[PDB]
Amino acid sequence: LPFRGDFDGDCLHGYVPQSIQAKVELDELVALDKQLINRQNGRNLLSLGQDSLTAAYLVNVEKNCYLNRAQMQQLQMYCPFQLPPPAIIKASPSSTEPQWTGMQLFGMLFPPGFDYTYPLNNVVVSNGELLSFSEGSAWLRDGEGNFIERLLKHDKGKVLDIIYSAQEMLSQWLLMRGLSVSLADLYLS
Amino acid sequence: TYQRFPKIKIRELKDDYAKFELRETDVSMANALRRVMISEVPTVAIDLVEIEVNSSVLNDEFIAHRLGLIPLTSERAMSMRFSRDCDACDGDGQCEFCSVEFRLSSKCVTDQTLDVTSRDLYSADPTVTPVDHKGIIIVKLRRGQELKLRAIARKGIGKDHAKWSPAATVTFMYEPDIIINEDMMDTLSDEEKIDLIESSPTKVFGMDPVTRQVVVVDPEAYTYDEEVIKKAEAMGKPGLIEISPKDDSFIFTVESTGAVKASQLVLNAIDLLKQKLDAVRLSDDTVEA
Amino acid sequence: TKKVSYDRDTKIINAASFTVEREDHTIGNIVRMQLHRDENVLFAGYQLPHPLKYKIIVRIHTTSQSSPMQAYNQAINDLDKELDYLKNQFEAEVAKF
Amino acid sequence: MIIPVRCFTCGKVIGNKWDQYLDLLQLDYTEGDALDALQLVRYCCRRMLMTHVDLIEKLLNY
């Protein structure tokens, strides 16, 4: 996203330093852990990509998938936080295992102590767990107020370890569902 | 806590078309066996060739790629060693423990164009021979073109190259059970049942010609198209047919492509799945006691 | 040398993190579902961090009734004895035909 | 060039069933019906026999 290029054949120039005075200055003012603020706009620089944005949308909008404890503890390895308690103990008399909630799976990225409120999408994050969601997608991409900027203003030490786990877990979650464009999507009828 | 007990039932069994059931087990026993039977079981294939003279139309590197994909037979496939496990013999010859030789030699001197075949490869060991119809064509020689080479075949794992895998199509399905709500079948008329029968892609739901009832015939060919459920969903009878897959009772449709037998494929798979899970617990036994 | 490595976590009591070398998804999916069948395993999962390398990572968080080291042989032998029962069932069925 | 010996995706050997395909295409059979007599049920191993150019009969003249 800072490079503004795709993978359709674009090349990348590579410059290698040799002196120590050109090596210490690279990881102090030039490296990615230092220029995390896009000073042209005044907001975050590394937002969500293409697959992660769609996965973070579908997890919080679908709301009708109840994954059990078998496919939940596998997705708790890519995230550095522990598992929340199950919000559903028994959804049906034909169901015995406690199934989790889709919006409860997105709480494995926010740290304990994170406070975030967006009024246009009615999402409230209280003590590292989001609790509400009603028809919103503006708090995920590069907008005015989003959780990436509020995480960069919170601690600014492990944001690159948060967006990384927000991709390597959301990709494994989207692989379990599958996104495909069929002929009925062009038919729209 | 403890182990399970899987139950099988073989429907039909011939060469390279073995079909058997697999009941009372989860999907990670029918998938972790397919992933071994399709890529892990070793056979023999032509690896290194040595072309002496080539005067045909095709190049000398197009024939070395085609000759390695010939489905050679392999009866002593697990009893032989690899090329790296055998430090002796220095390659290049019939070692009779890690390699085998082949001798191709042909020349067209007549007027008509003769083509060489897979039944022309003569080996020194008559236990590793290409299977055989007409046969696999390689080149076509004109009046005055000759071909002579020398091939070396060795045992290899099918994870490295796609020529050692003896399984073309080995898959499995869930074999679902379908149920028909008989209390809501009499709501729809005859034409609605006809339009519901003709909406299925495969022959799953039939019709009794004496009472006009929807009778289930051959339920193993549904293939999860989800066209019968969505047809009754946009009609005057929602939830008429509820289809849910079973967690067990799978069926296997394996293919062995003529290299090894279909019975020896799933035996050499479970004889190697018993040794892949063997070096893990003995290397982690000294940290326990 | 040292194909299986034992790493014990400190922040969680009765917790381990097993890792092996030169393997694939054929073992991380057949050990996880065997550990999920047991009643003393509260956490079981495999993870491939880099597919260019060949190393799976299995994390086991058990209860206080048993060690996380003794809950691995009981999941390995439960497949090593199930494969023998599958072979003894297939060898008679192939001999019937 | 010539017909490949194995399918590019499945792995079923189809290098030998090329002369008997042109021998059944010499009759009044359809291209969709000449593959059912060679026991090909999937459309992976049928696009090799249905769509393949025979360049060696043009390359053997010289």
Place this chain on the structure above:
Amino acid sequence: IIMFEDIFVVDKLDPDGKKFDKVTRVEARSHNLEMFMHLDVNTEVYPLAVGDKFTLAMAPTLNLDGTPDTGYFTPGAKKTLADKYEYIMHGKLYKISERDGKTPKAELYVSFGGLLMLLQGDPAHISHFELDQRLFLLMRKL
């Protein structure tokens, strides 16, 4: 024990459909204690229709006077826990709001994971609920 128990009746559904792969905002109201329910529940795994009878409870624990807390995430069967109901949920309270104009205008905002539930009524019945509390949702259709 039970902090609040009532018998409601389904008034209206907000999507008002079937197999919509979403959640339905089932609006309900009491008849003996003057309450109002706004619980979100999917109709696919738990079928509900317009007009029925179902009891609802709300307890801070499920140990049945054996433990004052929930405990771990995966709770095993121990000492005959309360399993007489059919629809058991879990969630945390986050907002207590009031309103003017009428006497029964004290609402109650709770979130069972990702869903929501509004409990509007008189302040005398919901006076036993604190802020940031871990509650349960015991339900059974009869």
Place this chain on the structure above:
Amino acid sequence: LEEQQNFPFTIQGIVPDIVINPHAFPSRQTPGQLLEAALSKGIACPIQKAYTKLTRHATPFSTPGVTEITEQLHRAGFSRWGNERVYNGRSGEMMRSMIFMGPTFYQRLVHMSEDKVK
């Protein structure tokens, strides 16, 4: 370059050898590739039972409609819209959404990897 067992496999035995991103469709604005993939699939798969009444022209300015492809693909066992239920390669469980499949026609260009390293 993923191995063969890791791809999502189908019930019949076919394996997808090229998997493209579905996000490139509403931005490049290229429809008719899903129509080419549905017209090349109905003429390669065998009819159970009529190998003469099928349309396989795909003329540029005389294109057949969607109601002619979705009724020709239905007469052979596959779905109408071309998608089919696929499984998983790593885990083995079923997927909640079907995946469209079809034998398209891809070309390889001149610009390789070794001709650009410097």
Place this chain on the structure above:
Amino acid sequence: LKEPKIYTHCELDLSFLLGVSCAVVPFANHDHGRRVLYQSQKHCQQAIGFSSTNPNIRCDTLSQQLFYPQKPLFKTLASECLKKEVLFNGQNAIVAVNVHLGYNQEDSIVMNKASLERGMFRS
């Protein structure tokens, strides 16, 4: 032509209004206006495929050739009256639209390891 008796001329075919590299593309009107212009004179000119049948008399640099060329499954009307099967370069592939672990992000393609070793796309 059959319904109105007012016409005095007629076209031979509507597909015969484009070039030889554009009138063989299937569904040429369904595509975008800047997406068949990006392929009729930008992708077919640098696509490997058939070559000269006599490689013993023609000696020029960068003469690449595919091992197993394949005609497409469809048969357009501009490729039937021409009686030529050389203007179609490349092989067929059963594609599938799927989010595959994020490895095909930003207009990328993930491929098969067990298909490039059997003869597909070898040149």
